[PDB]
Amino acid sequence: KLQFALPHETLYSEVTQVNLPAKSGRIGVLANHVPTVEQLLPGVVEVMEGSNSKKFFISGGFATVQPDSQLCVTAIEAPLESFSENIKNLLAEAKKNVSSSREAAEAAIQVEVLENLQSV
Amino acid sequence: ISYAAYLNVAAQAIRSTELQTASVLNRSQTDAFYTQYKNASEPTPITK
Amino acid sequence: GDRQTGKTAVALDTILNQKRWNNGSDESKKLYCVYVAVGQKRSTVAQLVQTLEQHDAMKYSIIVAATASEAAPLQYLAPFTAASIGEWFRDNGKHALIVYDDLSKQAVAYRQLSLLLRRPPGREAYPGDVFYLHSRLLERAAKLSEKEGSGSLTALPVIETQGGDVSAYIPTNVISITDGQIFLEAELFYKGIRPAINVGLSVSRVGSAAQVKALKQVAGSLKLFLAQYREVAAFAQSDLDASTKQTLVRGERLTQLLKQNQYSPLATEEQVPLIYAGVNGHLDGIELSRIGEFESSFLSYLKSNHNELLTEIREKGELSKELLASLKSATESFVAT
Amino acid sequence: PTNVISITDGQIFLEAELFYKGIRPAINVGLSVSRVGSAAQVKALKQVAGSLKLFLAQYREVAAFAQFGSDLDASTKQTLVRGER
Amino acid sequence: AEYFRDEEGQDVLLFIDNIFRFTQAGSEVSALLGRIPSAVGYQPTLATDMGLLQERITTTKKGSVTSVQAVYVPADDLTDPAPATTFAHLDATTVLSRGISELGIYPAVDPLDSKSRLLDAAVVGQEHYDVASKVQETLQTYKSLQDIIAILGMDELSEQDKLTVERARKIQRFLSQPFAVAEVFTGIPGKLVRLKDTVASFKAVLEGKYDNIPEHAFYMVGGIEDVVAKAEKLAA
Amino acid sequence: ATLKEVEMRLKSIKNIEKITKTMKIVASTRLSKAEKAKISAKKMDEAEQLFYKNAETKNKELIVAITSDKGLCGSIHSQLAKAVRRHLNDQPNADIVTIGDKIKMQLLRTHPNNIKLSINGIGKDAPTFQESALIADKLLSVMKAGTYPKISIFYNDPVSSLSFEPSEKPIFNAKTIEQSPSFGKFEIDTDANVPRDLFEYTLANQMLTAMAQGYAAEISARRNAMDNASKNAGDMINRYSILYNRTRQAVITNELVDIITGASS
């Protein structure tokens, strides 16, 4: 099972295998998994409920197997349209502008998002 | 910087596509302000 | 109803439809109308006459005229005089319709008379025996017994409500005397809903006893729907219950359906199919703007497809399960186009 | 009063409530008229008081909203602030 | 007027002022005649006296006379029997309202409070009628919405509603026609706008063709040509 | 007059009745969105609460409170103020974050040695992640909130769509995680500074939910108040109407007497 939640929606909150991008590298969870907290990073996430796998672009969150083996994943918003080139063009310009222009965290995000986008 | 501010900035940056849900566009666009206060006394308010 | 809302227009529409029935052989179907134009300026009545002539209605119509100039004794005796004309028809066993328009101006003439004879003026400075006057006139409108050769003098008095006050002394009295009232609503008139009838403040006591059976069947529902629509009127201020939102849609389409452009009557055989459609919610789906287009088209569509049905419906005057079945189907076919 | 109103070429309604409100004299300026109007008004004073009426008229509408005592349209609060003065 | 209508044969344009003064006068001499004045002190013979005057004014085959009769409605109460009695006898009523006057609009008529007998659809022409139904709705929408704009706020209303309001505000100030006889009451000259020209110019506004022209660029100016000119003038 | 002054005041009452009726209907419309947000949010929140609970949820102090810029939210503004007022007797020197103008006025009254941060532009907007994040970002740096033992947030739990209960809950410090020991029944090494990240993350995750809960109660109160107003105005309508009717009769009588006297003479 998986609980993958959003503030305004819920994505999965008996998901068989989840492949997660974590502050522990990448983590895979299937059923009972070791009882962890790993921060879900800004991510391209694959969630498989059964063998069927769905691929998500997420603006990060937190990932937590509970000690009752409930994978509470909480995330706060984002597809495949998001990947579609138009984002790359805009992001290229925006990344450049941020380069010239807390600024560290922002610039890190422009690059990070460029990676995060490529992951889709 | 706040971890969720980092995540937030990431959500905003991902919109640099915009071809997605209305709730997102509202969730990422806020004209809201904030008013600093001190002990009553008001340090100037500034846009959030 | 309220002054100059074309009160006379609402009345005149009835007279025009009486042409259809007038053409018809039965002399109960020949209502020989009498319009009693009281205090109405001669130019206005000339227009009335001209319009009547345009619609070739002057040959069952009678116009008793006491115009604005015409003296208060003439005005006073004018409905009484008119009633006597009606008596010949009534006595002959025929039916006829006398429209006293407006008894409010009759009242003023009596006020003038009473004051000139220095008899004390009653409540609201309208003479005390105004109740007596109006009552004497208004019970001459009567459907005689079959030994008295089943005849009648139908009447439809018109009362002008100065501020819309039915609380006004002459309206209150008259309301008590009469057997039903139809109260046109000024707001509806302003909102271009003509007829402008205030459905709640309109009642007929005889009512459905004197209703075509076909029309009764297919418009019992209409009364209940409109009742809900009235409550759900205020629900037009939105997230609404699905039932409420459906009611609102169904109700709005109905309100438009009951619009009938002034000075154009309709045939009963064409009233009944349209209301049936609305009852079956066929019209609910049809867009509000396209209701109008739908109506005339539907009537022609019906006329082409089955004027056998229309004539059958007309002549039977009842709607049989077979006819209503066919009608639901017919409506579906029309709805598709 | 009806008779006189017809006869006269102005009406200068006063308002008692406004007297208490502290306009003393309190002229009920909405009902205060000079029927034929202005032609005996100082030229300077014609120029200056040109929009005094407009502001006040807007103020009357604005005041109705203001006494509903809800959060106000910014435009209405320009009126409100000026109007009070 | 009768001599002109009849004997000179010509058409006339009668003008009478102020017929409430005629009512007051008649009320007084009724009382003096000992004929006890009826409701709200108004003579019992008011109706018939009105009738004689009014019937006398008409379109005969000898001539045609267009009376324009001023009436003073005491304390703006038209439920009062004297204005109300006159209200019936007159062909083409108009009600002048203070609020609209105060808004600066000249004329001061509240157009949702004006009803002329000629308004029948084919009579005034289908286009004219349809336009006039639309104008009435547009202005009526602004008035109905005025309460919502007022308390709930302007912007909470629909975009469609807001556009109708914007058009109504433009139209409202497109009612403002500076008057030639208010070159002394405003200084600004008149505008004599042809009937066809008015139908066309109002139609255009409704179509939203000149929603790129300010509300105030309709204010105190004439027709479409003027509206554009004042848009340019303000722009300059 | 009597007749006219009755009528004008009665007209005022009529117009008010109508506005409060109108507002009440519109409030029902708004309420649906507020509640909808709150469901999904609350589901998310419970998952976070699973971490704190299972971890052991063992945690001056901070006070955060929420009530919109907007008024006519019934007595949300002052009922929340009342439950605050009690806890400003439990700490008269608490550092206050006021989320929206209405709560700001009331709390400012209760102790003005507290107010440090307040947030404008709240009421108009329905709860949103952008806001929660930004409020969070300024909060850590400015208020040093985690340093003060215990954080508590006040909001209105939307008990029923006819009720509102002012409620508070405790936002958990980095300390809560730290010395709660069944935090060890979750596993991370030092590869993430999970207190320094998660605290920041849960600042928003809880706050956004609190706001959603509040917003639903706020709109619910607005509906309730506006409904009761329509009723109160109605009662007054009836009272002045009866007076109007009597006054009408009196005018008729006074006029009638004049006529009688005239006829008599």
mmCIF file of C-alpha atoms in Angstrom, chain F:
data_model
loop_
_atom_site.group_PDB
_atom_site.id
_atom_site.type_symbol
_atom_site.label_atom_id
_atom_site.label_comp_id
_atom_site.label_asym_id
_atom_site.label_seq_id
_atom_site.Cartn_x
_atom_site.Cartn_y
_atom_site.Cartn_z
ATOM 1 C CA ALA F 1 -44.239 61.441 9.349
ATOM 2 C CA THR F 2 -45.137 58.303 11.215
ATOM 3 C CA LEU F 3 -46.239 56.779 7.920
ATOM 4 C CA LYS F 4 -43.161 57.776 5.947
ATOM 5 C CA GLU F 5 -40.578 57.378 8.749
ATOM 6 C CA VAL F 6 -41.900 53.911 9.475
ATOM 7 C CA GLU F 7 -41.731 53.187 5.781
ATOM 8 C CA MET F 8 -38.163 54.463 5.207
ATOM 9 C CA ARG F 9 -36.783 52.595 8.235
ATOM 10 C CA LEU F 10 -38.809 49.563 7.122
ATOM 11 C CA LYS F 11 -37.334 49.932 3.631
ATOM 12 C CA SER F 12 -33.844 50.015 5.133
ATOM 13 C CA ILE F 13 -34.712 46.823 7.032
ATOM 14 C CA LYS F 14 -36.081 45.273 3.809
ATOM 15 C CA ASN F 15 -32.903 46.114 1.872
ATOM 16 C CA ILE F 16 -30.714 44.721 4.659
ATOM 17 C CA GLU F 17 -32.866 41.520 4.775
ATOM 18 C CA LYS F 18 -32.256 41.091 1.068
ATOM 19 C CA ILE F 19 -28.478 41.711 1.220
ATOM 20 C CA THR F 20 -28.004 39.265 4.113
ATOM 21 C CA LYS F 21 -30.180 36.696 2.325
ATOM 22 C CA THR F 22 -28.109 37.130 -0.872
ATOM 23 C CA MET F 23 -24.830 36.867 1.014
ATOM 24 C CA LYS F 24 -26.078 33.693 2.796
ATOM 25 C CA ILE F 25 -26.770 31.926 -0.553
ATOM 26 C CA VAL F 26 -23.398 32.993 -1.995
ATOM 27 C CA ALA F 27 -21.803 31.755 1.270
ATOM 28 C CA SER F 28 -23.202 28.247 0.667
ATOM 29 C CA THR F 29 -21.557 28.330 -2.799
ATOM 30 C CA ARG F 30 -18.179 29.401 -1.322
ATOM 31 C CA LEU F 31 -18.445 26.816 1.492
ATOM 32 C CA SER F 32 -18.317 23.914 -0.957
ATOM 33 C CA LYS F 33 -14.815 24.835 -2.226
ATOM 34 C CA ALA F 34 -13.546 25.439 1.312
ATOM 35 C CA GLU F 35 -14.731 22.044 2.543
ATOM 36 C CA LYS F 36 -13.459 20.227 -0.569
ATOM 37 C CA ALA F 37 -9.932 21.533 -0.020
ATOM 38 C CA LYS F 38 -10.162 20.590 3.667
ATOM 39 C CA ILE F 39 -10.936 16.882 2.998
ATOM 40 C CA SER F 40 -7.826 16.210 0.872
ATOM 41 C CA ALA F 41 -5.715 18.373 3.156
ATOM 42 C CA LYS F 42 -6.971 16.590 6.285
ATOM 43 C CA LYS F 43 -6.167 13.211 4.701
ATOM 44 C CA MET F 44 -2.625 14.447 4.057
ATOM 45 C CA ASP F 45 -2.353 15.864 7.617
ATOM 46 C CA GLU F 46 -3.323 12.598 9.293
ATOM 47 C CA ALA F 47 -0.431 10.871 7.522
ATOM 48 C CA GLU F 48 1.969 13.449 8.995
ATOM 49 C CA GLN F 49 0.294 12.982 12.375
ATOM 50 C CA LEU F 50 1.029 9.247 12.019
ATOM 51 C CA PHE F 51 4.715 10.145 12.024
ATOM 52 C CA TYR F 52 4.477 12.403 15.104
ATOM 53 C CA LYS F 53 2.210 10.052 17.075
ATOM 54 C CA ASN F 54 4.054 6.851 16.289
ATOM 55 C CA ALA F 55 7.333 8.671 16.967
ATOM 56 C CA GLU F 56 5.794 9.718 20.255
ATOM 57 C CA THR F 57 4.350 13.158 19.771
ATOM 58 C CA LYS F 58 6.086 14.201 23.008
ATOM 59 C CA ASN F 59 7.177 17.779 22.484
ATOM 60 C CA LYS F 60 7.553 31.122 26.026
ATOM 61 C CA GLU F 61 5.497 29.413 23.347
ATOM 62 C CA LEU F 62 4.268 30.576 19.969
ATOM 63 C CA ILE F 63 0.662 31.289 19.134
ATOM 64 C CA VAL F 64 -0.522 31.423 15.580
ATOM 65 C CA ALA F 65 -4.156 32.167 14.942
ATOM 66 C CA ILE F 66 -6.164 32.379 11.760
ATOM 67 C CA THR F 67 -9.217 34.421 10.794
ATOM 68 C CA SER F 68 -9.532 36.077 7.410
ATOM 69 C CA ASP F 69 -9.212 39.701 6.416
ATOM 70 C CA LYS F 70 -12.915 39.335 5.649
ATOM 71 C CA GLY F 71 -15.584 40.013 8.257
ATOM 72 C CA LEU F 72 -19.219 38.879 8.366
ATOM 73 C CA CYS F 73 -17.681 35.522 9.098
ATOM 74 C CA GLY F 74 -20.097 35.507 11.994
ATOM 75 C CA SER F 75 -18.414 35.454 15.369
ATOM 76 C CA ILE F 76 -15.437 33.397 14.131
ATOM 77 C CA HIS F 77 -13.283 36.458 14.614
ATOM 78 C CA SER F 78 -14.276 36.886 18.223
ATOM 79 C CA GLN F 79 -14.927 33.222 19.195
ATOM 80 C CA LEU F 80 -11.441 32.381 18.086
ATOM 81 C CA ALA F 81 -10.414 35.539 19.918
ATOM 82 C CA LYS F 82 -12.093 34.208 23.078
ATOM 83 C CA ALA F 83 -10.279 30.870 22.972
ATOM 84 C CA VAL F 84 -7.071 32.867 22.396
ATOM 85 C CA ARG F 85 -7.930 35.221 25.299
ATOM 86 C CA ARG F 86 -7.965 32.272 27.653
ATOM 87 C CA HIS F 87 -4.478 31.270 26.459
ATOM 88 C CA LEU F 88 -3.290 34.874 26.689
ATOM 89 C CA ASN F 89 -3.996 34.375 30.356
ATOM 90 C CA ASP F 90 -1.857 31.231 30.059
ATOM 91 C CA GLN F 91 0.945 33.270 28.479
ATOM 92 C CA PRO F 92 0.336 37.060 28.190
ATOM 93 C CA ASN F 93 3.669 37.382 26.403
ATOM 94 C CA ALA F 94 3.316 34.839 23.615
ATOM 95 C CA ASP F 95 4.714 35.656 20.202
ATOM 96 C CA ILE F 96 1.807 36.109 17.850
ATOM 97 C CA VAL F 97 1.466 35.337 14.170
ATOM 98 C CA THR F 98 -1.982 36.584 13.094
ATOM 99 C CA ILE F 99 -3.173 35.132 9.825
ATOM 100 C CA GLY F 100 -5.739 37.628 8.461
ATOM 101 C CA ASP F 101 -7.066 40.997 9.677
ATOM 102 C CA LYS F 102 -10.142 39.971 11.690
ATOM 103 C CA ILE F 103 -8.307 37.865 14.265
ATOM 104 C CA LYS F 104 -5.578 40.551 14.294
ATOM 105 C CA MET F 105 -7.868 43.229 15.686
ATOM 106 C CA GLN F 106 -9.160 41.053 18.528
ATOM 107 C CA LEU F 107 -5.786 39.594 19.563
ATOM 108 C CA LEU F 108 -4.169 43.059 19.365
ATOM 109 C CA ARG F 109 -6.645 44.078 22.040
ATOM 110 C CA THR F 110 -5.918 40.995 24.155
ATOM 111 C CA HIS F 111 -2.166 41.671 24.533
ATOM 112 C CA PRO F 112 -0.112 44.148 22.464
ATOM 113 C CA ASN F 113 3.254 42.943 23.823
ATOM 114 C CA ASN F 114 2.952 39.900 21.598
ATOM 115 C CA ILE F 115 2.264 40.954 18.012
ATOM 116 C CA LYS F 116 5.334 40.452 15.843
ATOM 117 C CA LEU F 117 4.029 39.079 12.611
ATOM 118 C CA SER F 118 0.696 39.269 10.940
ATOM 119 C CA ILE F 119 -0.262 38.279 7.423
ATOM 120 C CA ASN F 120 -2.478 40.366 5.178
ATOM 121 C CA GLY F 121 -4.215 39.222 1.980
ATOM 122 C CA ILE F 122 -5.236 36.029 3.759
ATOM 123 C CA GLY F 123 -8.978 36.226 3.836
ATOM 124 C CA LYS F 124 -9.691 36.824 0.192
ATOM 125 C CA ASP F 125 -7.650 33.865 -0.945
ATOM 126 C CA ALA F 126 -8.663 30.308 -0.180
ATOM 127 C CA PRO F 127 -5.738 28.355 1.479
ATOM 128 C CA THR F 128 -2.845 27.689 -0.948
ATOM 129 C CA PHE F 129 0.572 26.019 -0.802
ATOM 130 C CA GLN F 130 2.401 29.158 -2.021
ATOM 131 C CA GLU F 131 1.112 31.129 0.915
ATOM 132 C CA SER F 132 1.819 28.411 3.449
ATOM 133 C CA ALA F 133 5.368 28.089 2.180
ATOM 134 C CA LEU F 134 6.070 31.820 2.217
ATOM 135 C CA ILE F 135 4.585 32.265 5.714
ATOM 136 C CA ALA F 136 6.725 29.353 6.824
ATOM 137 C CA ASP F 137 9.851 30.826 5.258
ATOM 138 C CA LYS F 138 9.511 34.142 7.039
ATOM 139 C CA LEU F 139 8.453 32.451 10.290
ATOM 140 C CA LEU F 140 11.623 30.482 11.001
ATOM 141 C CA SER F 141 13.995 33.370 10.529
ATOM 142 C CA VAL F 142 11.921 36.116 12.122
ATOM 143 C CA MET F 143 10.171 34.470 15.033
ATOM 144 C CA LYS F 144 12.778 31.852 16.090
ATOM 145 C CA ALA F 145 9.640 29.939 16.994
ATOM 146 C CA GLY F 146 11.190 26.522 17.486
ATOM 147 C CA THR F 147 13.460 28.046 20.124
ATOM 148 C CA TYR F 148 10.403 28.853 22.235
ATOM 149 C CA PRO F 149 9.177 25.545 23.802
ATOM 150 C CA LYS F 150 5.873 24.536 22.213
ATOM 151 C CA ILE F 151 4.205 26.045 19.169
ATOM 152 C CA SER F 152 0.441 26.199 19.058
ATOM 153 C CA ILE F 153 -1.735 27.267 16.219
ATOM 154 C CA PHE F 154 -5.315 28.244 16.496
ATOM 155 C CA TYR F 155 -7.799 27.800 13.750
ATOM 156 C CA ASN F 156 -11.468 26.924 13.695
ATOM 157 C CA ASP F 157 -12.267 23.258 13.340
ATOM 158 C CA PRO F 158 -15.356 23.177 11.086
ATOM 159 C CA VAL F 159 -17.508 20.934 13.273
ATOM 160 C CA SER F 160 -20.650 20.999 11.140
ATOM 161 C CA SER F 161 -21.784 23.161 8.247
ATOM 162 C CA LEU F 162 -23.940 25.023 10.755
ATOM 163 C CA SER F 163 -21.246 25.275 13.467
ATOM 164 C CA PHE F 164 -17.714 26.356 14.141
ATOM 165 C CA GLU F 165 -15.660 25.407 17.133
ATOM 166 C CA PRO F 166 -12.497 27.385 17.812
ATOM 167 C CA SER F 167 -9.659 24.928 18.082
ATOM 168 C CA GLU F 168 -5.959 24.887 18.621
ATOM 169 C CA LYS F 169 -3.385 22.219 18.076
ATOM 170 C CA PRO F 170 0.317 22.080 18.786
ATOM 171 C CA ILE F 171 2.844 22.391 16.002
ATOM 172 C CA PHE F 172 5.817 20.242 16.830
ATOM 173 C CA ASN F 173 9.335 21.557 17.229
ATOM 174 C CA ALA F 174 12.593 19.972 16.074
ATOM 175 C CA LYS F 175 12.750 19.125 19.773
ATOM 176 C CA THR F 176 9.578 16.963 19.504
ATOM 177 C CA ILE F 177 11.329 14.689 17.039
ATOM 178 C CA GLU F 178 14.634 14.906 18.895
ATOM 179 C CA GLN F 179 13.771 13.501 22.283
ATOM 180 C CA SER F 180 10.814 11.456 21.217
ATOM 181 C CA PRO F 181 12.612 8.064 21.061
ATOM 182 C CA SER F 182 10.221 6.062 18.858
ATOM 183 C CA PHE F 183 11.643 8.383 16.220
ATOM 184 C CA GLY F 184 14.129 5.488 16.186
ATOM 185 C CA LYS F 185 11.273 3.352 14.792
ATOM 186 C CA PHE F 186 11.946 5.402 11.706
ATOM 187 C CA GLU F 187 15.413 5.204 10.236
ATOM 188 C CA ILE F 188 17.677 7.880 8.914
ATOM 189 C CA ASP F 189 21.360 8.262 9.707
ATOM 190 C CA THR F 190 22.666 11.798 9.290
ATOM 191 C CA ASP F 191 22.327 11.682 5.483
ATOM 192 C CA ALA F 192 19.422 14.041 5.947
ATOM 193 C CA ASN F 193 19.073 16.493 8.790
ATOM 194 C CA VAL F 194 15.479 15.329 9.121
ATOM 195 C CA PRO F 195 14.653 17.720 12.004
ATOM 196 C CA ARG F 196 16.018 20.649 10.014
ATOM 197 C CA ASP F 197 14.086 19.565 6.907
ATOM 198 C CA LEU F 198 10.955 17.944 8.303
ATOM 199 C CA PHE F 199 10.300 20.721 10.819
ATOM 200 C CA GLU F 200 10.287 23.139 7.942
ATOM 201 C CA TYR F 201 8.131 20.742 5.881
ATOM 202 C CA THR F 202 5.590 20.156 8.674
ATOM 203 C CA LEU F 203 5.399 23.873 9.399
ATOM 204 C CA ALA F 204 3.583 24.162 6.140
ATOM 205 C CA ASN F 205 1.947 20.736 6.063
ATOM 206 C CA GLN F 206 0.171 21.396 9.337
ATOM 207 C CA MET F 207 -0.409 25.078 8.640
ATOM 208 C CA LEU F 208 -2.065 24.592 5.291
ATOM 209 C CA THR F 209 -4.448 22.069 6.841
ATOM 210 C CA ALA F 210 -5.165 24.382 9.771
ATOM 211 C CA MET F 211 -6.050 27.115 7.325
ATOM 212 C CA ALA F 212 -8.307 24.756 5.353
ATOM 213 C CA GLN F 213 -10.127 23.698 8.518
ATOM 214 C CA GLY F 214 -10.416 27.347 9.463
ATOM 215 C CA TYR F 215 -11.632 28.502 6.046
ATOM 216 C CA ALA F 216 -14.489 26.013 6.028
ATOM 217 C CA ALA F 217 -15.568 27.127 9.503
ATOM 218 C CA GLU F 218 -15.198 30.777 8.495
ATOM 219 C CA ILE F 219 -17.476 30.462 5.490
ATOM 220 C CA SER F 220 -19.826 28.278 7.568
ATOM 221 C CA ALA F 221 -20.102 31.050 10.133
ATOM 222 C CA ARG F 222 -20.663 33.633 7.398
ATOM 223 C CA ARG F 223 -23.601 31.599 6.144
ATOM 224 C CA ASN F 224 -24.992 31.147 9.653
ATOM 225 C CA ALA F 225 -24.781 34.801 10.557
ATOM 226 C CA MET F 226 -26.270 35.943 7.287
ATOM 227 C CA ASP F 227 -29.150 33.483 7.650
ATOM 228 C CA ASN F 228 -30.035 34.645 11.171
ATOM 229 C CA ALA F 229 -29.856 38.237 9.992
ATOM 230 C CA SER F 230 -32.513 37.589 7.338
ATOM 231 C CA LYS F 231 -34.731 36.270 10.134
ATOM 232 C CA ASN F 232 -34.111 39.218 12.469
ATOM 233 C CA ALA F 233 -34.820 41.695 9.694
ATOM 234 C CA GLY F 234 -38.008 39.807 8.909
ATOM 235 C CA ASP F 235 -39.268 40.179 12.482
ATOM 236 C CA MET F 236 -38.660 43.906 12.387
ATOM 237 C CA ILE F 237 -40.347 44.074 8.959
ATOM 238 C CA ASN F 238 -43.469 42.580 10.488
ATOM 239 C CA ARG F 239 -43.424 44.947 13.453
ATOM 240 C CA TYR F 240 -43.173 48.099 11.361
ATOM 241 C CA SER F 241 -45.712 46.722 8.874
ATOM 242 C CA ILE F 242 -48.437 46.444 11.510
ATOM 243 C CA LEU F 243 -47.597 49.946 12.645
ATOM 244 C CA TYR F 244 -47.760 51.117 9.020
ATOM 245 C CA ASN F 245 -51.205 49.553 8.607
ATOM 246 C CA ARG F 246 -52.549 51.223 11.739
ATOM 247 C CA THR F 247 -51.017 54.555 10.721
ATOM 248 C CA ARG F 248 -52.671 54.242 7.323
ATOM 249 C CA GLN F 249 -56.038 53.828 8.992
ATOM 250 C CA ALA F 250 -55.412 56.875 11.145
ATOM 251 C CA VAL F 251 -54.635 59.070 8.139
ATOM 252 C CA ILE F 252 -57.866 57.938 6.494
ATOM 253 C CA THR F 253 -59.770 58.734 9.665
ATOM 254 C CA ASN F 254 -58.213 62.171 10.067
ATOM 255 C CA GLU F 255 -59.029 63.030 6.483
ATOM 256 C CA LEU F 256 -62.507 61.590 6.919
ATOM 257 C CA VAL F 257 -63.140 63.834 9.897
ATOM 258 C CA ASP F 258 -62.202 66.877 7.823
ATOM 259 C CA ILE F 259 -64.700 65.869 5.160
ATOM 260 C CA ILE F 260 -67.431 65.183 7.722
ATOM 261 C CA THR F 261 -66.874 68.572 9.313
ATOM 262 C CA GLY F 262 -67.005 70.222 5.909
ATOM 263 C CA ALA F 263 -70.219 68.497 4.936
ATOM 264 C CA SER F 264 -71.680 69.327 8.341
ATOM 265 C CA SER F 265 -70.952 73.002 7.789
#
